[PDB]
Amino acid sequence: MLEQPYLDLAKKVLDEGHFKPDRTHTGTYSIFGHQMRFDLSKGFPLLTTKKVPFGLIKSELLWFLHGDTNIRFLLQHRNHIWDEWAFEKWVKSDEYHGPPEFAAVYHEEMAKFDDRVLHDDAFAAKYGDLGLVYGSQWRAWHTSKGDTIDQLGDVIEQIKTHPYSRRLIVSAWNPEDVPTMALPPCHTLYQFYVNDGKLSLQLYQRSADIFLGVPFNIASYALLTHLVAHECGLEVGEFIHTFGDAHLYVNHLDQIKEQLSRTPRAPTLQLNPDKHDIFDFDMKDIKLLNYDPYPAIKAPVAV
Amino acid sequence: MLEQPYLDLAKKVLDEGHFKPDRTHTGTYSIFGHQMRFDLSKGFPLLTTKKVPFGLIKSELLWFLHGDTNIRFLLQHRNHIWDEWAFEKWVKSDEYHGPPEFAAVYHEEMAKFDDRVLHDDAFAAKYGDLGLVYGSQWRAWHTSKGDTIDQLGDVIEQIKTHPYSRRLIVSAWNPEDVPTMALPPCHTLYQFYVNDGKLSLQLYQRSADIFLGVPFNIASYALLTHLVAHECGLEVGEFIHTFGDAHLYVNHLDQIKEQLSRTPRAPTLQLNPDKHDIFDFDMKDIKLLNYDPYPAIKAPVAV
Ligand SMILES: O=c1ccn([C@H]2C[C@H](O)[C@@H](COP(=O)(O)O)O2)c(=O)[nH]1
Ligand SMILES: O=c1ccn([C@H]2C[C@H](O)[C@@H](COP(=O)(O)O)O2)c(=O)[nH]1
Ligand SMILES: Cc1cccc2c1C(=O)N(c1ccnc(Cl)c1)C2=O
Numbered sequence: 001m002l003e004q005p006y007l008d009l010a011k012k013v014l015d016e017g018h019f020k021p022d023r024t025h026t027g028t029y030s031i032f033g034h035q036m037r038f039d040l041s042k043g044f045p046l047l048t049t050k051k052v053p054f055g056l057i058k059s060e061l062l063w064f065l066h067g068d069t070n071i072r073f074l075l076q077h078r079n080h081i082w083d084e085w086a087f088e089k090w091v092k093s094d095e096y097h098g099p100p101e102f103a104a105v106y107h108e109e110m111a112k113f114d115d116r117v118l119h120d121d122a123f124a125a126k127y128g129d130l131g132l133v134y135g136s137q138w139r140a141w142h143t144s145k146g147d148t149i150d151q152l153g154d155v156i157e158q159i160k161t162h163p164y165s166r167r168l169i170v171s172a173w174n175p176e177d178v179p180t181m182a183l184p185p186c187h188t189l190y191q192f193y194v195n196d197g198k199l200s201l202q203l204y205q206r207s208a209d210i211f212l213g214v215p216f217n218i219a220s221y222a223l224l225t226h227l228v229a230h231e232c233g234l235e236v237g238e239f240i241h242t243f244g245d246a247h248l249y250v251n252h253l254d255q256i257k258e259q260l261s262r263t264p265r266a267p268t269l270q271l272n273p274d275k276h277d278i279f280d281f282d283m284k285d286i287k288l289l290n291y292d293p294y295p296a297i298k299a300p301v302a303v
Numbered sequence: 304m305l306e307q308p309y310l311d312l313a314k315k316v317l318d319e320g321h322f323k324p325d326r327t328h329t330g331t332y333s334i335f336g337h338q339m340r341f342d343l344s345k346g347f348p349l350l351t352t353k354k355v356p357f358g359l360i361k362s363e364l365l366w367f368l369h370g371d372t373n374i375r376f377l378l379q380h381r382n383h384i385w386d387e388w389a390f391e392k393w394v395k396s397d398e399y400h401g402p403p404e405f406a407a408v409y410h411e412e413m414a415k416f417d418d419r420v421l422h423d424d425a426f427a428a429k430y431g432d433l434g435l436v437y438g439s440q441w442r443a444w445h446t447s448k449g450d451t452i453d454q455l456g457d458v459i460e461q462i463k464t465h466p467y468s469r470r471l472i473v474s475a476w477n478p479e480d481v482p483t484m485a486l487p488p489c490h491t492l493y494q495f496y497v498n499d500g501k502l503s504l505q506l507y508q509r510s511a512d513i514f515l516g517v518p519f520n521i522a523s524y525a526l527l528t529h530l531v532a533h534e535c536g537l538e539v540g541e542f543i544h545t546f547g548d549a550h551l552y553v554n555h556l557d558q559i560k561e562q563l564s565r566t567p568r569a570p571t572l573q574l575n576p577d578k579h580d581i582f583d584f585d586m587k588d589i590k591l592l593n594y595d596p597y598p599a600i601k602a603p604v605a606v
């Protein structure tokens with residue numbers, strides 16, 4: 001099945017991984033350097049064996065494609081993926097006043113913050129704006145001359161003109177910023193590849209939470225490859241997912257067994273037949289057919 | 304054998320690669336996304352089946368470790384690897400006067416240039432200095448504030464303090480410079496990894512000439528892993544070589560058969576037992592034992 005490689009990497013790490021401490025202080029089982037391929041011509045690799053809300057994948061990806069770094073857009077779409085980190089520029093702040101039942105009055109203050117990012121421009125501008133996150137790296141990289149490079153936009157022209165180039169690289173890794181930056185980007189870099197009609201994409205992912213993060217990350221960049229083939233009028237080849245540290249968090253050990261005895265089912269993807277400027281896609285330009293997942297598995301997001 | 308993965312990737316590309324045009328206009332057989340592992344504890348992976356001059360690998364690597372970008376240091380060591388690209392800032396120049404038997408009077412003007420880089424400081428400074436090449440990317444990355452980051456140096460402290468970090472990334476890919484730069488770096492990025500006593504390193508290599516380039520590149524970064532384990536007092540785990548476009552150039556098709564019926568032999572590496580500041584290694588701090596290669600195979604360096 002299309003998603004076997006994901007199931008194989010959970011198996012491998014579980015049966016061969018070596019206990020590893022982590023920044024988080026959860027602890028992990030980990031392997032270094034692993035690859036999976038997904039032949040995108042065979043269907044779209046959204047995990048069946050456990051539910052991965054595609055609404056969520058595409059809003060965030062469209063948030064990336066626009067060069068947006070403000071939670072607000074994600075909020076206009078019920079996407080709460082990135083709420084945490086915007087909340088902390090406010091959870092710490094000097095414009096801040098306010099406070100187990102943390103489990104419930106954390107929600108009360110989260111529902112507050114969401115609300116006024118959603119409606120108060122000045123608050124949004126100060127707390128909603130996540131800053132140095134994939135939208136800026138991708139389409140507004142801060143040149144040393146105080147300018148800004150549209151990196152993805154630039155590489156798509158190059159796919160169109162010089163499809164055969166081995167330089168079709170977009171990076172998210174900025175050595176000037178990674179020392180003191182909230183999340184040095186997990187998706188360090190990717191590279192496209194055109195051979196005879198088919199565009200492929202490889203992601204180098206420095207660090208991978210296999211239970212929680214990877215199901216999504218596969219879809220974000222599988223989705224990204226389609227969208228880029230679409231705009232270049234190419235067919236789709238493969239998505240290659242390459243990993244540094246691929247790890248299972250130790251509290252996810254239960255869940256991943258749970259998931260591993262599921263029996264995989266694979267959806268198809270449908271792109272607007274008459275739009276091509278992907279920087280200009282909204283949610284109805286991307287449609288997933290025949291997604292039939294098993295339900296969500298409850299997992300403690302390890303720190 | 305230790306070098307089988309290299310032999311397997313030449314086989315794979317030869318038996319499964321798909322004709323691909325290239326910047327060069329030689330043409331190639333290519334695959335996208337491939338990985339090889341070399342367990343450095345089992346011996347050093349310098350190809351036996353064809354000769355790879357280790358003198359050359361280590362001078363260039365020490366040239367990198369010093370943050371040097373001038374051909375001169377390579378010249379003081381009979382390393383001619385990078386002569387070409389320094390010659391062109393002079394092969395084109397406005398301080399330039401001078402001129403088949405290009406095959407022999409190319410050599411006459413190369414032997415001139417080498418000589419006076421070797422001895423004339425001002426010429427060296429103008430023509431020998433390659434500029435934006437792995438030494439600057441690694442230990443002097445040009446911050447946006449006109450400063451300079453010692454990136455490798457910085458990540459080695461982090462290995463020492465935070466060995467378990469999945470952020471141990473050094474990159475050579477600078478989006479501000481890759482549009483108009485002689486060689487966008489083929490060795491785009493690498494990442495270290497420490498699990499229980501053993502340091503590992505993964506290289507993401509965007510583009511790989513499998514006959515000419517890869518034998519060297521394996522050794523440069525296998526060598527790099529040792530040197531870094533050594534300085535951190537770690538043992539050595541694996542070198543993982545990850546590729547974008549791994550290609551055979553079409554004029555190398557003969558040679559790589561020639562090489563493929565050779566029968567692999569694997570050297571050992573010996574590091575100074577009493578030095579650790581690798582930024583301060585000279586050539587006698589690195590010694591290779593029991594290297595026993597088959598001889599060099601003559602190959603047209605495809606553009
Ligand atoms: O898209 C993402 C973003 C984050 N992570 C995970 C990987 C790590 O477990 C954790 C924090 O990363 P480190 O900086 O500690 O590597 O978040 C993912 O798996 N996928
Ligand atoms: O260390 C190196 C440096 C260069 N190349 C090769 C790969 C390509 O065949 C050629 C030029 O690279 P491109 O920019 O066209 O990808 O040089 C290597 O294999 N290894
Ligand atoms: C809500 C939820 C629930 C389960 C798992 C995940 C998320 C989420 O936002 N992400 C995520 C995606 C992209 N970037 C980040 Cl920081 C996180 C997950 O991996």
Ligand SMILES: Cc1cccc2c1C(=O)N(c1ccnc(Cl)c1)C2=O
Nearest residue numbers: 363383384385515516517519520604
């Ligand atoms: C002399 C010779 C002969 C055969 C093969 C190679 C070289 C060389 O300098 N390199 C090389 C290494 C690192 N960077 C570059 Cl641009 C080239 C080769 O791959």
